[PDB]
Design an enzyme around this catalytic site. Structure first.
Site, PDB file in Angstrom:
ATOM      1  N   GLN B   1       0.860  -1.223   0.000  1.00  0.00           N
ATOM      2  CA  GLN B   1       0.000   0.000   0.000  1.00  0.00           C
ATOM      3  C   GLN B   1       0.880   1.251   0.000  1.00  0.00           C
ATOM      4  OE1 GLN B   1      -2.260   2.410   2.645  1.00  0.00           O
ATOM      5  NE2 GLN B   1      -2.350   3.081   0.503  1.00  0.00           N
TER       6      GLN B   1
ATOM      7  N   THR G   1      -4.009   5.110  -4.595  1.00  0.00           N
ATOM      8  CA  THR G   1      -3.165   3.944  -4.205  1.00  0.00           C
ATOM      9  C   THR G   1      -2.845   3.104  -5.432  1.00  0.00           C
ATOM     10  OG1 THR G   1      -4.110   3.830  -1.964  1.00  0.00           O
ATOM     11  CG2 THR G   1      -3.002   1.840  -2.794  1.00  0.00           C
ATOM     12  N   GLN G   2      -1.559   2.986  -5.736  1.00  0.00           N
ATOM     13  CA  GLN G   2      -1.096   2.239  -6.896  1.00  0.00           C
ATOM     14  C   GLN G   2      -0.157   1.114  -6.479  1.00  0.00           C
ATOM     15  OE1 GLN G   2       0.539   4.199 -10.321  1.00  0.00           O
ATOM     16  NE2 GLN G   2      -0.907   5.916 -10.245  1.00  0.00           N
ATOM     17  N   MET G 107      -3.473  11.026  -2.643  1.00  0.00           N
ATOM     18  CA  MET G 107      -3.286   9.583  -2.448  1.00  0.00           C
ATOM     19  C   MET G 107      -3.390   8.790  -3.754  1.00  0.00           C
ATOM     20  SD  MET G 107      -2.353   9.049   0.596  1.00  0.00           S
ATOM     21  CE  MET G 107      -2.666   7.322   0.969  1.00  0.00           C
TER      22      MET G 107
END
Ligand SMILES: *[C@@](C)(CO)[C@](*)(O)[C@H](Cc1ccccc1)NC(=O)[C@H](Cc1ccc(OC)cc1)NC(=O)[C@H](C)NC(=O)CN1CCOCC1
Ligand SMILES: *[C@@](C)(CO)[C@](*)(O)[C@H](Cc1ccccc1)NC(=O)[C@H](Cc1ccc(OC)cc1)NC(=O)[C@H](C)NC(=O)CN1CCOCC1
Ligand SMILES: *[C@@](C)(CO)[C@](*)(O)[C@H](Cc1ccccc1)NC(=O)[C@H](Cc1ccc(OC)cc1)NC(=O)[C@H](C)NC(=O)CN1CCOCC1
Ligand SMILES: *[C@@](C)(CO)[C@](*)(O)[C@H](Cc1ccccc1)NC(=O)[C@H](Cc1ccc(OC)cc1)NC(=O)[C@H](C)NC(=O)CN1CCOCC1
Ligand SMILES: [Mg+2]
Ligand SMILES: [Mg+2]
Lengths: 195, 222, 196, 212, 222, 204, 233, 196, 195
Positions: B1, G1-2, G107
Site C-alpha cells: 500500500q 493507491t497504486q 493519495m
C-alpha cells in the site's frame, strides 16, 4: 479483585483490601478477604487474574509455613518479600505466568520496625511508606503525599486510611463493596471489624 | 500500500537574543541510509525580517514554506504593504498547519525574527499548528540531543549560584551574538557525532534590525 | 537461478548461471552453483542458497560414508539421499535440486527434485526461476544421443535465453561434463553467449 | 496534562500545569493552558495541543461576535455549547479535547462547564481534567469545603496541581493560577514546580516519600 | 556496518568501519568489528553486534581446542564449516553476516557467510549496510595480481566509500593483513579521518553549581 | 507493552584524571504512575560498579545474579574481580539468554586496582560490549544523555570538576524525559576512596 | 493507491565545468521478467533540458505527454519561444515537482523518481531530483534507485563538493558516468547492457547518444572460482 | 491465455488459443480471443474476460465514431484509445491487450499494452499467462520481413509450445491475417499442432 | 450513562435514571439528570454513546416543542414515540448513526392512560408495563415479572422501584451514584427529591 492499599506508620503496617468479587455483570460476593497470613508477623494482600491470586497466595503461604516449622524461626519481612519476588521473577518467563500483584506488610521483631513491600506480577519489588496496586494508586498516592507523616500513630494511620477509602468511593467507577482492614505490629496481626 | 510520508532527516535550532535572533539548520538531506544532498538548504528568508524552517518531511516542509512565503505576499497586497509582525506570522502559520489537521504536514516548524518592541523572538510549532514563543528551541531528528543542552546553557536550568546552598538560582541574562553562535556550532557538532541523519554542513541565518545575514560552517560528512 | 542437466551419447552435462541475489541486489555475480557430491555425481542448486548448501554437504557426507563401506554409489542412490532430506524436511526447506551422474553401466543419468521432495528421472531437466522462459525452446531443440559439441551448444543457447529474460539469472555460464574420460569444467563469458 | 477548577464561597479557582508531551519526550515546560476569552471568561486546555489551542481561540472569536451582535456578554452556558456543538460535528474524526469553560455572569453567577471531544457537556462545581486528573482529585476532594477563604482556595488549587505534577509523568513544569470573581478573572502568577515543591515540602511538612 | 575482504599476491586483507548504531543513534563511535578466530584467521562482522561477537568467540574457542587436539595450525575452511553449520541450525535468528579470511598450510583464503548459513568464495567481497558503496569501489578498481600495498589501499578505500556515503557506517577504518609465511598484522584505527574539531567553549562549571541534599562515605573494603 | 520503557530510568558513566564517575536517577514507575522515588539503579561488587537501566524486575534479578557470581569468583580466585573481567562476565551472562533476554541496559564503571587505569563500558540487552574512553549512557533518556555528554564532556577532568559535569549531564537530560528523574545519585570514584552524593533535582 | 507494473531502474547524473551529464538504461522490467528492451527513459525538452525518469513506465509515458504538451503551450502567443522566453530547466522541474506533490496529496501518486538535468539561460548548471512523494533535492551528483547506492559513491569521488565542479572536464565526467553504468550492470538484477547518455553543455549544446553498450567488463576471474568453500574441483 | 501478434512482409498476423478458465475448470474451450475493433484493426485479449470485453467494446465505439467524422483511423490511434482506457482505469482493470492493424502507408504494425497502461510498439509481441514459456523460442526464431507461410508456422509452433506447457491455455489455435488483400481467418486443431 | 428504568402503573409513569457520568477511571459527575421534557405530559430518558445522548435528546425536544407551538396542541405519547422511532430508524443507516437508547414515559390526556415506550438505537419500539435499557434489564425484568401488578398506585410503584434500585446497587459491578426519579401523570411531570 481490584483495590489493595498499604500504609506503614511509626509502629505498625496497615493493609486495606476490597471485599467485592465480581465476574461479568454480577457481584458474586461482597465479604471477600483478599489476604493470607504468611507468618505471625507477616501479612500479604493480593490482586490480579481470577484464580491465580489465591493459588499464588496459598502457594507462598505453604512455603513460608514450611520454613517456619523446619527452622522453628520466623523469616524477616525483607526475607519473605525477596522470596516472593523471586517466585514472580521466575513466573514471568514461564509458559503461563502468575498474573498477581501483592503487598507484603510485616513487623520485623529484630529491628522493631514495621515494613511495607510492593511487588507486581513481573517481580518488581520496592519498599515504601505507603503503597497501592491497580487503579487505586492514581488517587491514593497523591493524597498520601499530602497527608502522610512518618511519625504517625496507628489510630492516625486508620484515619488517613479512611480518607483514602472515602476518595475511592467517590471517584472510582466500580463498586468495590468497602474494605477489610488489618493491622500488623509487634503483637502480631489483628482485624478491624468495624470499618 | 502507498505511504504518502517520508523522513528526510536533519535538524534545526532557534535561539533569541536581546536585539537579535538566529535560526540554524544542517544542510544534509537523506532517505533511509542514503545521502541525497550534502548541501540542500532548509532555512529560508521569508521577508519582513522573518526566517523560517519546517524540518522533517521535505516535501511537506517545502510546501509549507512556499505557502507561508505566499501568505506574506498577499498580506502586503491586502493591507497596504504593512509589515507582518512575528506574532501575526505565527498565528497565520497555525491556520496553515491546522488546515490539514486530518492529513498533516509531517514537520516541526520554527520561525525567528524580532517582536514589535525590537526584541529577539523564536516561535515553534508542532505538525498540526500548536505554537509557543520561547527563548530557545531545537527541532527535527536530533532535537532530543540538542534541546536539553540549550535548557542548561541558554536558560541556565539546574544551575545554582556557588556557595548559596542550592538556594539562589543562576540569574537569567541575554546572550551576545558571539556567545549564541558558539552554542549553535557546538550543538550541531555534538549532534553530528551521535546522530546519523545530521552532518555535512551548518547554515545559520542571523536576524537583526539591519536585516538577515548568513553564515556557513562545515560539518562531518560521515 | 537458471540451471539444467542434459544426458547425451557419451554421458551427461550439467549447466548453470552464476548469479546470487538478495532482493534486486546481486550478492555474487560469479557463483558456482554446480557442486560435487561424489567423483562423478554432481548437482545443480536452486532455491535457498543456505538450504541447498546444507543439504549438499549432508549428501556429500552420506556418499563419502557409503563409498567407505559399499564402494561407488549409483546416481539413483545419490538422488534418493537428496530426496530423503528434501521430503522429510519439506516444511522447513526451499530447495530445488537437479542430480546428475555418470555410471559405466547406466551411462548418463539425470534426476530432478522439486520443492515437494518428489523424484523424477528424465533424459534432461531444467529448473530455477529462469527455466520458465526456456520450456518452449528446450522441448523443441532437445534430441536423445546428442554429441558432446551438440549438447554443449544446446545448454549454452538454452541458458543464454534463460539469462536474457530472467533478472534473477546472469553472469557466466558454468558447465560440468561427466563422461568415462573424466570430469571437465567449462566456462562461457557474456561477450560470447549474449550475441548468440 | 492536569487541569482543575472548582466553585466555592468566594468565586471560582482555576489551576493548570504547563507541560507538553510528544510521547515520553517532554516537548515543553512553559505552555499556557488557560485561554483568556474575555475579562469574565476563561477556558482550560487538555488533550491534543493544536486542537485545544485552535478551537478555543476560535471560540473566543465566536464569543466576540456574539457581544457585537447582541450588545451583551455571552453566557457561560452559551459559550460552552458553541464549543460542544462544534466538536460534536467532528465526532469520530479524531479530535482530542478536554476543556473547562469557567466564568461569571449576572444571570448565572459563577459557573463551570466541562466539555470534551466526544460531545459530553456538563455543568458542575468541581472538575479535574487531563492525564493527571485523578491525582488532583485526590488532594482537592479530601480538602474541599464550600466555606474556604480566597487565600486557602488559591493554595488548594495550586497544591492539587503540584500533587499531580509530581506523580503524573505527563504533567509538570509550572502552575498557572487564576481567580474568578463577580468583577472578572484575576491572574495569580506562574509558579515553577522546580522551586514550589521544596518550598511546599519544607513549610507544609508533606511529600515525605521523597528524599529530603 | 561496512566490511570488506580483498585477496592479493601472497595473502589476504580484510577491513571494517568502527560505527555501532541503535536506531538512528550512534551507540559506539569506535567499536572493533575485526575479530580474531585464531592467530592467522580473522573475521569481519556485520549485523546483530553481539551475534557477530559471540559466534566468532565460540567458533574461535572450538578452533583453538581443535588445533591443540590435531597438533596442526587451524584452517579457514574449518572455521567456515563450523560457522555456517552453527548459523544454519538457528535458521537466521543469529543475525551474523561475516567475512572470514586467513592463511593456513593450504594457502590464503577469503569467504563470506550469511546469517542463514550460506557461504561464498571470492577475490573481493563486501557485507553490511555499506556493502553497495564498497562493492562499487571494488568493482571499479580491483584487478588480478594485486600487491600487498595496493590491496590495503583498495580495501581501505572501499571502507571509506561506506563511511562517507552510508549512514550506517562511519568513524575510523580498521584493517588486518594476513600474508603467507608472516605474522598477521592487526592495524587498529589504520585511518582516522573523522577527528572531532575543537569545541568553541569549555563547559567546566563553577564548583558548587549543583545543589546537594546528602553526603556520605561509601565502604568498599571488608 | 515495551519492556524497556515501562518502569523508566537512566544511568551515565564518565572518566576523569585518575578517576571515574557513575550516576543514576531514582524513579520507578508503572508507565505514567510514579511509584517509588528511592529506587537506586547502581550497585557495586568490591570496587567494580554496575549501573542497570530498563525493566526493574530484571535490574533486581541481575544485581542478585552478579552478586552471586562475583562472590563465588572471589572465593575461588581469592581476589576481587576487576572491571575488564567483570565486563566480560556481564556479556557472557546476557548472551546466555539470547532468545529470551533480560530487558536491561547495564553499564560497568571502576578503576583497575593493578594498573590504576580508569575503565567504563556499556552493553545492549543481548551482551554486545561498548567500551569507551570518554563516557557511556543508558536508559529512556539515552538520546538526551548522548547530547549532554557529547557537548559538556572534556578529557582529564579532576574529581571535583567531573562531579559537576556528570551531574549536569544527568539532571538536564532527566528533565526532558517523562519516565526519568524523581531524584538522583552520583558516585565519584578515586583509586581508594568513593564519595556518594544525592542531588537536588526538580520532582516532576 | 497504486502498485507499479512495468518499471525502469536507475537514472544517474552529475555536473561538470561547462554543463551536466545524465544517463539511463533502455530496459522496461515486468517484475523479474526483463520484458521490454527498446525503452528510452531520457526525454529531451527543447535544446537545453533532459528529463530522466525511473519507476512506473505507464506513468513515465504520461509525464512524456505532459512535457510534450508543455512545449506546445509555451509556444502559444510567444514570439520569443525559441529565445528569451524558452522553457528553462528550472521551469520544467518546478512544474513536475508541483504535479508530483499534488498527486501524492490526493493519495494517487505518479510512481516515479525523476531527475531534471539541464543548463539555464545564464550558463548555470541545473540538476535537481523529485519523486512520487514530491520530495525535492539538488546535489553535484544525483541518482535514483540502485544508482543512489552504487553510482553516487563513485561520482562523488570526482565531484565531492561545489568547488570540484570547475575542476572537472567533460571527458573525465563522461568516463565516470560510463563506469558507473558498468558497475550497475554487474550488480543490479533489473538492469540491461544497452543504455542512453545525454550531455547538456553551455557551449556545444545538447548531445544525445543512443544505443551505447557496457564494455571492457571483467569476467575472466570467474573461471578460477570453485564451489562455496570446500571443493578443490 | 496465450496470445501473440507478428508483423511480416505483406502485413501482420494475430494469433491466440481458445481456452477460458474459471479456476481449474475450463468454462469455454472454443473461445474467440481475437476481436475486431475496425475493418483491419484487431486485438488479442488477455486478463479479465469481462474487463477486456468492456474495453474492446468502448474502443470499437470510439473508432466507429472516429471513422464517421475523420475517416479510417491509424493503428497507432487505436492503440492510443486502448491505452487511455487502461491507464486511466488502472486501479480497477486487469487487462493485457495486444493491438495489431494494417495500414497501406504504414503496412503492418503491432502495439502491446500490459497491465500498467503503458504502450509499446514492437515488430512482434507476446502476452498472456502462457507467453512466459516461449520468450526463449520466439526470440531465437523471429525474423523481420517473413513470408505469410513462414509467419503462420512461427505463430503455430510458438502457440503450440505455449499451450503444451501452460495449463491456462489450450483448445484450438485461432489466427487472423491482415494484409492489403483483406482479412483471412485461420484455425488449427489439436491433432495437427500437438504433434509438431 | 448506563441505567435507565421505567414503570407504568394505574395512573402514572415513573422513570428512574442514574446520576453518574464516568469517563475512564474517574466519575466526573454524580448528580446528572439523564432526561428531557419533550412536552408537559411527555418525558424521555436516554442512555448510550457520550455526546450522542444529549445531542439526540435535545434535537427531539426542539422538534416536539416546535410542533406544540405550531399547532397549539400537545402530541400524544404514542405520536411522539413514533416520531422518535423514525428518527432512529433513519439514523441507523446514516454515515454516523446516533447510538442512543431511550424510554418515553407519557400521560395521554385524551385516553386518561399512562404509557411507557422503549426504543433502542436501531429504532425498535415497544410499549411495555415496565422497561429498561442496558445491563439493568438483566436484573429488573425478572424482579418486576414477580412483584409488578397492573392496578398499583404511584406510591406502590415507587416502592417497587426502590426494590429495583436496591438490587442493582447490590449486584451491578459499577457505582452509578443512585438515581433521579420522575413521575408523569394527569397533572404533568414532577421530580422526587428524596430518593
Ligand atoms: C536464483 C537466484 C533464484 O532461484 C537461484 O535459485 C539461487 C540459487 C543459488 C544461489 C547461490 C548458490 C547456489 C544456488 N538462489 C538465490 O540466490 C537465493 C534467492 C532465494 C533466497 C531464498 C529463497 O527461499 C526463501 C529462495 C530464493 N538467494 C539467497 O539465498 C541469498 C544469499 N540470501 C537471501 O536472500 C536471504 N534470504 C534468506 C531467506 O529469507 C529471506 C532472506
Ligand atoms: C498533558 C501534557 C498530556 O498530554 C496535556 O494533555 C497536554 C495539553 C496541552 C494543551 C495545550 C498545549 C500543549 C499541551 N497535551 C499535550 O501535550 C499533547 C498530548 C497529546 C498528543 C497527541 C494526541 O493525539 C490527538 C493527544 C494528546 N501533545 C501534543 O499535542 C503534541 C505536542 N503534538 C503532537 O503530538 C502532534 N500530533 C498531534 C495529533 O496529530 C498528529 C500530530
Ligand atoms: C552497522 C553499524 C549496522 O548499521 C553494523 O552492521 C553493526 C555491526 C557491528 C556493530 C558492533 C560490533 C560488531 C558489529 N551493527 C550494529 O551496530 C547493530 C545494528 C543492528 C541493530 C538491530 C538489528 O536487528 C534487529 C540488526 C542490526 N546494532 C546492534 O546490534 C546494537 C548494538 N544492539 C541493538 O540494537 C539491540 N538489538 C539486539 C539485537 O536484537 C534487536 C535489538
Ligand atoms: C488466460 C486464461 C489467463 O490469462 C487468458 O488471459 C483469458 C483471457 C480471455 C478469456 C476469455 C475471453 C477473452 C480473453 N482469461 C480468462 O479466461 C480469465 C482468467 C482471469 C480472470 C480474472 C483475472 O483478473 C482478476 C485474470 C484472469 N477468466 C475469466 O475472466 C472468467 C470468465 N471469469 C472468472 O474467472 C471470474 N473471476 C472474475 C474476477 O474475480 C474472480 C472471479
Ligand atoms: Mg539477466
Ligand atoms: Mg510528573
Amino acid at each position: 479483585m481490584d483495590i489493595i492499599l498499604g500504609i506503614r506508620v511509626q509502629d505498625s503496617v496497615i493493609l486495606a483490601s476490597s471485599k467485592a468479587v465480581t465476574r461479568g455483570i454480577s457481584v458474586l460476593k461482597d465479604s471477600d478477604d483478599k489476604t493470607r497470613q504468611l507468618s505471625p508477623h507477616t501479612l500479604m494482600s493480593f490482586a490480579g487474574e481470577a484464580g491465580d491470586t489465591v493459588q499464588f497466595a496459598e502457594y507462598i503461604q505453604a512455603n513460608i509455613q514450611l520454613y517456619s516449622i523446619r527452622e522453628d524461626y520466623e523469616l524477616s519481612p525483607q526475607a519473605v518479600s525477596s522470596f516472593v519476588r523471586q517466585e514472580l521473577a521466575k513466573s514471568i518467563r514461564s509458559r503461563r505466568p502468575y498474573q498477581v500483584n501483592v503487598l507484603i506488610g510485616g513487623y520485623d521483631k529484630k529491628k522493631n520496625k514495621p515494613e511495607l513491600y510492593q511487588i507486581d506480577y513481573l517481580g518488581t519489588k520496592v519498599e515504601l511508606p505507603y503503597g497501592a496496586h491497580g487503579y487505586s494508586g492514581f488517587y491514593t498516592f497523591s493524597l498520601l503525599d499530602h497527608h502522610y507523616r512518618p511519625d504517625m500513630t496507628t489510630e492516625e494511620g486508620l484515619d488517613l486510611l479512611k480518607l483514602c477509602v472515602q476518595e475511592l468511593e467517590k471517584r472510582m467507577p466500580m463498586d468495590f463493596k468497602g474494605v477489610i482492614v488489618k493491622i500488623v505490629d509487634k503483637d502480631g496481626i489483628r482485624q478491624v471489624d468495624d470499618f | 500500500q502507498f505511504n504518502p510520508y517520508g523522513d528526510n532527516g536533519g535538524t534545526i535550532l532557534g535561539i533569541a537574543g536581546e536585539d537579535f535572533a538566529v535560526l540554524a539548520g544542517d544542510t544534509r538531506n537523506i532517505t533511509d541510509y542514503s545521502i541525497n544532498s550534502r548541501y540542500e538548504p532548509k532555512v529560508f528568508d521569508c521577508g519582513d525580517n522573518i526566517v523560517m524552517s519546517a524540518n522533517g518531511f521535505a516535501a511537506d516542509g517545502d510546501a509549507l514554506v512556499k505557502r507561508f512565503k505566499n501568505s506574506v505576499k498577499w498580506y502586503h497586497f491586502d493591507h497596504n504593504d504593512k509589515k507582518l509582525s512575528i506574532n501575526s506570522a505565527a498565528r497565520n502559520i497555525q491556520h496553515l498547519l491546522y488546515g490539514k489537521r486530518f492529513f498533516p504536514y509531517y514537520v516541526h516548524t520554527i520561525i525567528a525574527g524580532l517582536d514589535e518592541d525590537g526584541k529577539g523572538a523564536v516561535y515553534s510549532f508542532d505538525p498540526v499548528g500548536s505554537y509557543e514563543r520561547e527563548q530557545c528551541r531545537a527541532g527535527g531528528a536530533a532535537a532530543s540531543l540538542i534541546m536539553p543542552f540549550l535548557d542548561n546553557q541558554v536558560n541556565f536550568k539546574n544551575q545554582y549560584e556557588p556557595g548559596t546552598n542550592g538556594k539562589v538560582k543562576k540569574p537569567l541574562k541575554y546572550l551576545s551574538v558571539e556567545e549564541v553562535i558558539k552554542l549553535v556550532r557546538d550543538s550541531f557538532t555534538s549532534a553530528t557525532e551521535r546522530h546519523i541523519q545530521v552532518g555535512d554542513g551548518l547554515e545559520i541565518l542571523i536576524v537583526t534590525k539591519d536585516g538577515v545575514r548568513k553564515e556557513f560552517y562545515e560539518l562531518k560528512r560521515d | 537461478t537458471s540451471i539444467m542437466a542434459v544426458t547425451f551419447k557419451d554421458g551427461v552435462i550439467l549447466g548453470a548461471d552464476s548469479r546470487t541475489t538478495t532482493g534486486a541486489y546481486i550478492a555474487n555475480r560469479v557463483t558456482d552453483k554446480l557442486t560435487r557430491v561424489h567423483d562423478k555425481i554432481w548437482c545443480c542448486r536452486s532455491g535457498s542458497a543456505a538450504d541447498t548448501q546444507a543439504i549438499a554437504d549432508i549428501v556429500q557426507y552420506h556418499l563419502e560414508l557409503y563409498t567407505s563401506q559399499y564402494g561407488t554409489p549409483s546416481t539413483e542412490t545419490a538422488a534418493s539421499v537428496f530426496k530423503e532430506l528434501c521430503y522429510e524436511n519439506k516444511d522447513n526447506l526451499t530447495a530445488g535440486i537437479i542430480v546428475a551422474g555418470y555410471d559405466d553401466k547406466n551411462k548418463g543419468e539425470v534426476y530432478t527434485i522439486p520443492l515437494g521432495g518428489s523424484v523424477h528421472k528424465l533424459p534432461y531437466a531444467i529448473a530455477g526461476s529462469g527455466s520458465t522462459f526456456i520450456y518452449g525452446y528446450c522441448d523443441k531443440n532437445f534430441r536423445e544421443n546428442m554429441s558432446k559439441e551438440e549438447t554443449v551448444d544446446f545448454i549454452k543457447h538454452s541458458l543464454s535465453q534463460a539469462i536474457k529474460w530472467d533478472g534473477s539469472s546472469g553472469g557466466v555460464i558454468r558447465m560440468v561434463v561427466l563422461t568415462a574420460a573424466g570430469v571437465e569444467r567449462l566456462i562461457f563469458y557474456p561477450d560470447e553467449y549474449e550475441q548468440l | 496534562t492536569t487541569t482543575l477548577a472548582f466553585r466555592f464561597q468566594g468565586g471560582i479557582i482555576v489551576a493548570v500545569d504547563s507541560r507538553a508531551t510528544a510521547g515520553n519526550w517532554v516537548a515543553s515546560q512553559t505552555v499556557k493552558k488557560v485561554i483568556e476569552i474575555n475579562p469574565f471568561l476563561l477556558g482550560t486546555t487538555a488533550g491534543g495541543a493544536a486542537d485545544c489551542q485552535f478551537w478555543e481561540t476560535w471560540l473566543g472569536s465566536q464569543c466576540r461576535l456574539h457581544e457585537l451582535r447582541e450588545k451583551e456578554r455571552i453566557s457561560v452556558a452559551a459559550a460552552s455549547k458553541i464549543l460542544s456543538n462544534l466538536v460534536y460535528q467532528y465526532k469520530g474524526a479524531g479530535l482530542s479535547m478536554g476543556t473547562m469553560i469557567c466564568g461569571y455572569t449576572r444571570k448565572e453567577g459563577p459557573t463551570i462547564y466541562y466539555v470534551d471531544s466526544d460531545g459530553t457537556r456538563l455543568k458542575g462545581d468541581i472538575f479535574c481534567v487531563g492525564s493527571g486528573q485523578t491525582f488532583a482529585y485526590g488532594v482537592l476532594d479530601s480538602n474541599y469545603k464550600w466555606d474556604l477563604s480566597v487565600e486557602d482556595a488559591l493554595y488548594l488549587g495550586k497544591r492539587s496541581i503540584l500533587a499531580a505534577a509530581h506523580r503524573d509523568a505527563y504533567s509538570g513544569g509550572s502552575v498557572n493560577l487564576y481567580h474568578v470573581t463577580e468583577d472578572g478573572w484575576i491572574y495569580h502568577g506562574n509558579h515553577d514546580v522546580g522551586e514550589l515543591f521544596w518550598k511546599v515540602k519544607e513549610e507544609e511538612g508533606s511529600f515525605n516519600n521523597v528524599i529530603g | 556496518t561496512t566490511i570488506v575482504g580483498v585477496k592479493f599476491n601472497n595473502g589476504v586483507v580484510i577491513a571494517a568501519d568502527t560505527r555501532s548504531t541503535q536506531g538512528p543513534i550512534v551507540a559506539d563511535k569506535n567499536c572493533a568489528k575485526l575479530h580474531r578466530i585464531s592467530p592467522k584467521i580473522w573475521c569481519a562482522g556485520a549485523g546483530t553486534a553481539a551475534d557477530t561477537e559471540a559466534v566468532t568467540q565460540l567458533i574461535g574457542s572450538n578452533i583453538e581446542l581443535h588445533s591443540l587436539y590435531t597438533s596442526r595450525e587451524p584452517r579457514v575452511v574449518s572455521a567456515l564449516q563450523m560457522l555456517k553449520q552453527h548459523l544454519f541450525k538457528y535458521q537466521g535468528h543469529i543475525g551474523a553476516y561475516l567475512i572470514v579470511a586467513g592463511v593456513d598450510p593450504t594457502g590464503s583464503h577469503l569467504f563470506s557467510i550469511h546469517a542463514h548459513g550460506s557461504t561464498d568464495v571470492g577475490y573481493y567481497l563486501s557485507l553490511g549496510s555499506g556493502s553497495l558503496a564498497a562493492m562499487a569501489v571494488l568493482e571499479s578498481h580491483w584487478k588480478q595480481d594485486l600487491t600487498k600495498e595496493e590491496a590495503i589501499k583498495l580495501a581501505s578505500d572501499a571502507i571509506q566509500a561506506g563511511i562517507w556515503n552510508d549512514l550506517g557506517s562511519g568513524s575510523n577504518v580498521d584493517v588486518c593483513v594476513m600474508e603467507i609465511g608472516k605474522d598477521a598484522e592487526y592495524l587498529r584505527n589504520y585511518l582516522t579521518p573523522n577527528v572531532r574539531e575543537e569545541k568553541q567553549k569549555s563547559y567546566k562549571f563553577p564548583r558548587g553549581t549543583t545543589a546537594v541534599l546528602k553526603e556520605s562515605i561509601v565502604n568498599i573494603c571488608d | 507493552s515495551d519492556p524497556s520503557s515501562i518502569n523508566g530510568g537512566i544511568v551515565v558513566a564518565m572518566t576523569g584524571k585518575d578517576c571515574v564517575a557513575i550516576a543514576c536517577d531514582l524513579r520507578l514507575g508503572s508507565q505514567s504512575l510514579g511509584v517509588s522515588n528511592k529506587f537506586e539503579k547502581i550497585f557495586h561488587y568490591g570496587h567494580v560498579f554496575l549501573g542497570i537501566t530498563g525493566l526493574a524486575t530484571d535490574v533486581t534479578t541481575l544485581n542478585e545474579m552478579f552478586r552471586y557470581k562475583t562472590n563465588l569468583y572471589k572465593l575461588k580466585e581469592e581476589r576481587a574481580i576487576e572491571p575488564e573481567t567483570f565486563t566480560q562476565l556481564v556479556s557472557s551472562s546476557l548472551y546466555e539468554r539470547r532468545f529470551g533476554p533480560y530487558f536491561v541496559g547495564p553499564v560497568v564503571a571502576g578503576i583497575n586496582s593493578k594498573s590504576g587505569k580508569p575503565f567504563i563500558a556499556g552493553f545492549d540487552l543481548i551482551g554486545c560490549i561498548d567500551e569507551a574512553k570518554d563516557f557511556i549512557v543508558s536508559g529512556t533518556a539515552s538520546d538526551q544523555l548522548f547530547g549532554m555528554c557529547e557537548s559538556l564532556y572534556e578529557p582529564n577532568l579532576e574529581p571535583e570538576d567531573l562531579f559537576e559535569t556528570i551531574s549536569q549531564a544527568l539532571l538536564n537530560a532527566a528533565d526532558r524525559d517523562a519516565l526519568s528523574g524523581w531524584g538522583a545519585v552520583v558516585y565519584i570514584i578515586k583509586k581508594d576512596e568513593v564519595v556518594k552524593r544525592y542531588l537536588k533535582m526538580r520532582q516532576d | 493507491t497504486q502498485q507499479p507494473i512495468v518499471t525502469g531502474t536507475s537514472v544517474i547524473s552529475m555536473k561538470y565545468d561547462n554543463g551536466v551529464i545524465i544517463a539511463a538504461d533502455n530496459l522496461g522490467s515486468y517484475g523479474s521478467l526483463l520484458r521490454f528492451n527498446g525503452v528510452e527513459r531520457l526525454i529531451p525538452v527543447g535544446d537545453n533540458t533532459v528529463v530522466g525518469i525511473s519507476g512506473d513506465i505507464s506513468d513515465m509515458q504520461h509525464i512524456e505527454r505532459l512535457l510534450k504538451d508543455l512545449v506546445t503551450e509555451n509556444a502559444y502567443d510567444n514570439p520569443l519561444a525559441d529565445a528569451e522566453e524558452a522553457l528553462e530547466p528550472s521551469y520544467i522541474f518546478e512544474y513536475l515537482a508541483t504535479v508530483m506533490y499534488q498527486r501524492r496529496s490526493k493519495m494517487n501518486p505518479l510512481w516515479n523518481a525523476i531527475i531534471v538535468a539541464g543548463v539555464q539561460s545564464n550558463g548555470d548548471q541545473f540538476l535537481r531530483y523529485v519523486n512520487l512523494l514530491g520530495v525535492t533535492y539538488s546535489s553535484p551528483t544525483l541518482a535514483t534507485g540502485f544508482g543512489a547506492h552504487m553510482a553516487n559513491p563513485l561520482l562523488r569521488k570526482v565531484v565531492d563538493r561545489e568547488s570540484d565542479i570547475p575542476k572537472t572536464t567533460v571527458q573525465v565526467a563522461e568516463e565516470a558516468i560510463v563506469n558507473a553504468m558498468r558497475v550497475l550492470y554487474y550488480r543490479d538484477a533489473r538492469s540491461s547492457r544497452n543504455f542512453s547518455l545525454a550531455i547538456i553543455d553551455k557551449n556545444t549544446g545538447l548531445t544525445f547518444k543512443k544505443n551505447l553498450q557496457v564494455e571492457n567488463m571483467k569476467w575472466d576471474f570467474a573461471k578460477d572460482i570453485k564451489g562455496y568453500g570446500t571443493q578443490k574441483i
